[PDB]
Structure formats: structure tokens, C-alpha cells
Amino acid sequence: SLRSDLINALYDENQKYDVCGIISAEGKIYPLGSDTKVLSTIFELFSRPIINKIAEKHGYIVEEPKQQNHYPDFTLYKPSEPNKKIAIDIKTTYTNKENEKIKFTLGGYTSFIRNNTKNIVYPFDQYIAHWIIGYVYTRVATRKSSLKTYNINELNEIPKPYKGVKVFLQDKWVIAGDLAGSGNTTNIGSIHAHYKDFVEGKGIFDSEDEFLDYWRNYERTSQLRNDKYNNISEYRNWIYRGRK
Amino acid sequence: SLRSDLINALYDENQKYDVCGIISAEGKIYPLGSDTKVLSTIFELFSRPIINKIAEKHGYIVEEPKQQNHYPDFTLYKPSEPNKKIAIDIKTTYTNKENEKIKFTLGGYTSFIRNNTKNIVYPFDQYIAHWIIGYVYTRVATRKSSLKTYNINELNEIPKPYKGVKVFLQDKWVIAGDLAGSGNTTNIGSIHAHYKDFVEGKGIFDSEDEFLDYWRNYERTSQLRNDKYNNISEYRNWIYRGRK
DNA sequence: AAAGATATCTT
DNA sequence: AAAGATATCTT
Ligand SMILES: [Ca+2]
Ligand SMILES: [Ca+2]
């Protein structure tokens, strides 16, 4: 399917190619930075061509946002089915060692999930799926990457800012956790778990209806949450009390 | 000086090279996206080797943050002058048509400017200068040719997501404005003016002491600024009255 | 954890 | 503008 073909293409492309720099039209190469900020940009650009290639094989148009603070990264849709749009968003995180627990931020809990047209390319009720493409890289220990430039014959001398990178495709609701991923920017937190848990889809929500309801009523601070719910157990108890 | 040599080298490099993609160690090239999240990253990486080359000719050490979430991008200093450190930060913004008015976010007003060791590589009082390397680009809409991968022999055929990149080097206090650059992430706002105003330093503050005092006492919300000051005129009146 | 830093944009 | 979106990290 579109999903199985996209997952296989992403696994493959990642296995084959290691991004190592930015290149000018003149052929001069500038090495990469160490932060997640440079690597989440690089992972998004890396996935673009793949997503477009797989979508075209399946008859889906691909549209990126026109505005800069909108979701999702990629909107897939057949022109004959306007309300079967698929949302694909790329998220990234790091580990210091290969097998520790990781976690992502999964977008806002106060924007398009509470308002049908807030910060989103198409009305939220036109989407039938919300997929996360998750990248995880292991930081290199060196905090002094290269400060020189390179030519096309020195490609294999360029220090890579990661040791290993893994990628998965999973539904957003399935890997969603019950604790905020950020405070002032109010992001859904994902589960806090090993990499295999995201691939396998071992979450905490019983359904996408429960995931949406949880995040739609989650309070912005601890103070407010202490009178309602802080976690999935307290949310289920809030449901028993009659949403009060 | 360090400064004059730095801006000549930045301006020259901008003029002679055009970034057009991310390259892998295998040689495959991925085209660029058109938003500031991508261009911000590319301009930082492009400037890194230039900053280090010029810094080294003046006998300055270049140190980058060891942790994410810390200012500044580049800390320059001599072993003989440890309390005369120079902070350099790269800021980027865009324009829809060449030469319209622009504005930048200049860093938090609630971190290192109010707490000497908050979110900064070195205590804030060891720095004697805070420079901004400002990048401005005109946005160019992505087309179909940006959605595939390229080989090195097609470098000059890759479509760029930008045009007319301009760069300046200026003191943070000199280009600082009196209105916040962001709400929930409490950043200082720069003046709102044309590129030449930034080059020439036509800001609203009379001194770096006034800049600092203004942003150290600026309240986070309009509700609170209503009773204090919202702009330079109100701040100067408040000061005239005895800070009340 | 919770809350607020890191940079910039939109309405 | 002011206020809160865009991603993700630290503490
Ligand atoms: Ca996104
Ligand atoms: Ca910075």
C-alpha cells in the first residue's frame, strides 16, 4: 500500500545514504552542525524526494504548506477523494547511546485539534490519517565538528555529526503519551520508550478517539490539571465522574 | 579590525557562492526547502568556516555551545583577555519582494540579560560585545524540479528556494527596537525597517545601557505594560518620573 | 515533571 | 501589536 511502500522506501534510503554537508552551485562543501536543529532540517529535506516518489506511484498529489507555521509537512490526496487526505509530519530526536528510551514532541494540543482550521493547510476534518515519520540519531561524542570547507573529491573525509540514524513511520495517536512534550508551546508528548516500541506501536491510548479527547481537554498548567487530570488514569477517572 | 575583516569576508562569500542542496557521502544531492527553518540552518553553516578563518587571523579562539538552548552561536576570545569575550549570533528573516521592510527576533529578554549565567555559554558579564550577523532573503516558491534527487554533474541545474540574499554585521543593542519580537518565547524585537537601516545602525536606543535597562524591566504582557511602558517614549517618561 | 529556554512567523 | 503558533530541548 502507500504506507508499506513509504516505510520500505524510507528504511532503504536511510540505509544507503549518509548526509554529510551542504553544497554550493560552485561545488564547495560546508560541513554540518551538531545540534538537533541542523539534523531535523536535514532529515526533513532528506525525506522529501522519497515521499514524493512513493505518493506519485499511488496517484496522490503532494502539497507542502504555503505558510511557515502550519501543519502538516506533507499533505497527500487523490483529486477524486478530497476528504481522504493523509497528513505526514517529520519529527526528530537524539540518543547518547544506541539503546536508551527516547521521546518526541508531537505537535500542538491547542491548535488544529481544538480548531478545525487553525494552523493547518486543509481543514482538519478532511484528513483521515496523521502519520509521523520519526528519525532518531545517536550523537557523536565530539562537540567540535569541522570548521573547514571541502571539495567534491573529499566527500569521505567530512565528519558526520551522527553515529547511526533510525527511522519509523507510525500513526500519531498510537505513539502519543499522556504528559506534555513542551510547556509554553503546549505540545503533545509521545510515549517515553525504546525505539522498538514506536515501530511496534505499543502505546497507552485505547483508541484515536481517546487520544483526541485526552489532548483536547488537557489543561495548560499543573495547577489546573490537579483539579482535573494529569495522566491517563486520572483522565479515565474524570470520564467516570461525568467530565467534571 | 576583526569586525571590518569579518564583514568583508561574509559579504564576499555571499556574493561568490550559492547553496543549493544537502549532499551525502555517496554523492547524492537533495534540494532545499523554501522556509526560514531551512535557510536559517544553511546560513549558519555557511558562516561557520568564515567566522573561524577571520577569528584565527586575529588570534581569537572560537567556541560553540556545548548544550542546545544556549547563546551565543559563536564565542570569540583571546586567552589573554578572558573577560573581553565577543558573542556572535546569526539571525535570519525573509522578504516577499526584494527590499521590503524587515524585522528580526534578537534573543530572549528573560534569560542571560536578567540572570548572568542563564542559558549562555559563559557568564554574561565576561562579554564586552554582542554582534548579530543578519541574513535576509527574498522567498521563491518551490517547483516540481525541487522534488527529486540530483547528481553532482547537475549542480547548476538545481532550483534554489531563494534570491537576493543580503547580509549585515551589527551590534545587538544598536538594531534593537522597543517591541517584543515574540510573545510566549519572550524575545527582544529588532527595529522594523529596511536593510540599510540595519547596516547604518539607525536603532531607537541612545546607548547599550538604555537598551539593557529597557529590556530588563519590560513586562511580558500588554496587561502589565499598560501600567509601566510599552514603547521608548513611555519608557523615557517612566525614567523621567523616577521609575514609576 | 513542569515550566520555560533555544529561533522565527502569522493573524 | 500582541499573542500564540511552528520543533525540541533542559533542568
Ligand atoms: Ca511540521
Ligand atoms: Ca543562536
C-alpha cell at A47: 525525506
* Residue pair A109/A152 in contact by the 8 Å Cβ criterion: no
> CA of B231: how far to CAs of A190, A234, B178, B214, B218, in Å?
41, 45, 5, 9, 9
Give the count of beta carbons closer than 10 Å to the beta carbon of residue A29: 18
Across-strand partners of B86? B76, B129
Residue nearest to nucleotide D10 (CA to C1'): B69
Residue B173, helix vs strand vs coil:
helix
> CA of B188: how far to CAs of A16, A156, B157, in Å?
43, 42, 40
Q: For residue B148, which residues of chain A lie inside 8 Å, CB to CB?
A: 49, 52-53
DSSP structural state of residue B243 = -
Angle between helices A208-217 and A232-240 (to 10 degrees): 90
Strand C-contacting residues in B 170-199, CB cut-off 7 angstroms: 181-183, 185-187
| d(C-alpha A187, C-alpha B186), whole Å | 18
- Report angle CA A70, B33, A76 to the nearest 5 degrees: 55
| d(C-alpha B8, C-alpha A224), whole Å | 54
| d(C-alpha A68, C-alpha B37), whole Å | 8
- Residue A169's contacts (CB-CB under 8 Å, 6 or more residues apart) are A3, A6, A7, A10, A131, A132, A133, A134
Residue nearest to nucleotide D6 (CA to C1'): A69
Of the candidates B193, B161, B187, B157, the residue with the CA atom closest to the CA atom of residue B175: B193
| d(C-alpha B5, C-alpha B102), whole Å | 25
Across-strand partners of A36? none
* Residue pair A19/A42 in contact by the 8 Å Cβ criterion: yes
| d(C-alpha B94, C-alpha B153), whole Å | 30
Going B121 to B123 to B124 to B128, the CA torsion angle's sign is negative
* Residue pair A13/A46 in contact by the 8 Å Cβ criterion: yes
Cell 488514569, residue located? A233
Any known ligand binding at A89? Answer: yes
Ligand 1 center to A106 CA (angstroms) = 9
Strands (E), B34-161: 61-63, 74-77, 85-95, 105-108, 127-139
> CA of A186: how far to CAs of A105, B10, B71, in Å?
10, 38, 23
Cell 561568490, residue located? B16
Cell 586567552, residue located? B79
Phi, psi of A155 (to 5 degrees): -50, -40
| d(C-alpha A93, C-alpha A102), whole Å | 7
Structural domain range at position B149: 1-244
Judge if the beta carbon of A68 is closer than 7 A to nucleic acid strand C: yes
Give the count of beta carbons closer than 10 Å to the beta carbon of residue A196: 11
DSSP structural state of residue B193 = B
- Residue by residue, what is the 3-state secondary structure of chain A? CHHHHHHHHHHHHHHHCCEEEEEECCCCEEECCCCHHHHHHHHHHHHHHHHHHHHHHCCCEEECCCCCCCECCEEEECCCCCCCEEEEEEEEEEECCCCCCECCEEEECCCCCCCCCCCECCCHHHEEEEEEEEEEEEECCCCCCCCCCECHHHHHHCCCCEEEEEEEEEEHHHHECCCCCECCCCEEEECCECHHHHHHCCCCCCCHHHHHHHHHHCCCCHHHHCCCCCCHHHHHHHHHCCCC
Task: Give me the amino acid identity at B153.
Answer: N
* Residue pair A132/A106 in contact by the 8 Å Cβ criterion: yes
Of the candidates B166, B8, B18, B144, the residue with the CA atom closest to the CA atom of residue B94: B166
CB-proximal residues (5 Å) to ion ligand 2: B 73, 89
Beta-sheet strand order (sheet of A61-63): A61-63, A74-77, A85-95, A127-139, A162-171
The CATH number given to whatever domain includes residue B35 is 3.40.600.10
* Residue pair B234/B226 in contact by the 8 Å Cβ criterion: no
Per the structure, how many domains does chain B have? 1
Angle between helices B2-16 and B36-57 (to 10 degrees): 130
Pairing mode, strands A85-95 and A127-139: parallel
| d(C-alpha A89, C-alpha A232), whole Å | 25
- Residue B58's contacts (CB-CB under 8 Å, 6 or more residues apart) are B2, B5
Is the Cβ pair B17, A32 closer than 8 Å?
Answer: no
* Residue pair A47/A133 in contact by the 8 Å Cβ criterion: yes
Phi, psi of B162 (to 5 degrees): -150, 170
Across-strand partners of B190? B176
Of the candidates B193, B189, B196, the residue with the CA atom closest to the CA atom of residue B166: B196
Across-strand partners of A85? A127
* Residue pair A170/A138 in contact by the 8 Å Cβ criterion: no
Give distance CA B220 / C1' D2 (Å): 10
* Residue pair B28/B149 in contact by the 8 Å Cβ criterion: yes
Is the Cβ pair B152, A152 closer than 8 Å?
Answer: yes
Residue B184, helix vs strand vs coil:
coil
| d(C-alpha B4, C-alpha A237), whole Å | 65
| d(C-alpha A23, C-alpha A169), whole Å | 29
DSSP structural state of residue B225 = H
Judge if the beta carbon of A99 is closer than 7 A to nucleic acid strand C: no
Contacts of the segment B199-207: beta carbons below 8 A, 24+ positions apart = B199/B168, B199/B170, B201/B170, B201/B171, B201/B174, B201/B175, B203/B173, B203/B174, B203/B175, B203/B176, B203/B177, B204/B176, B204/B177, B204/B178, B204/B232, B205/B173, B205/B174, B205/B176, B205/B232, B207/B173
Burial of B143 (0-12, 13-18, 19+ CB in 10 A): exposed
Going A75 to A77 to A79 to A84, the CA torsion angle's sign is negative
* Residue pair A187/A104 in contact by the 8 Å Cβ criterion: no
* Residue pair A27/A151 in contact by the 8 Å Cβ criterion: yes
Please give the distance of CA B160 from its chain centroid, rounded to a whole number. Answer: 22
Burial of A203 (0-12, 13-18, 19+ CB in 10 A): buried
| d(C-alpha A24, C-alpha A33), whole Å | 17
Of the candidates A104, A100, A106, A170, the residue with the CA atom closest to the CA atom of residue A138: A100
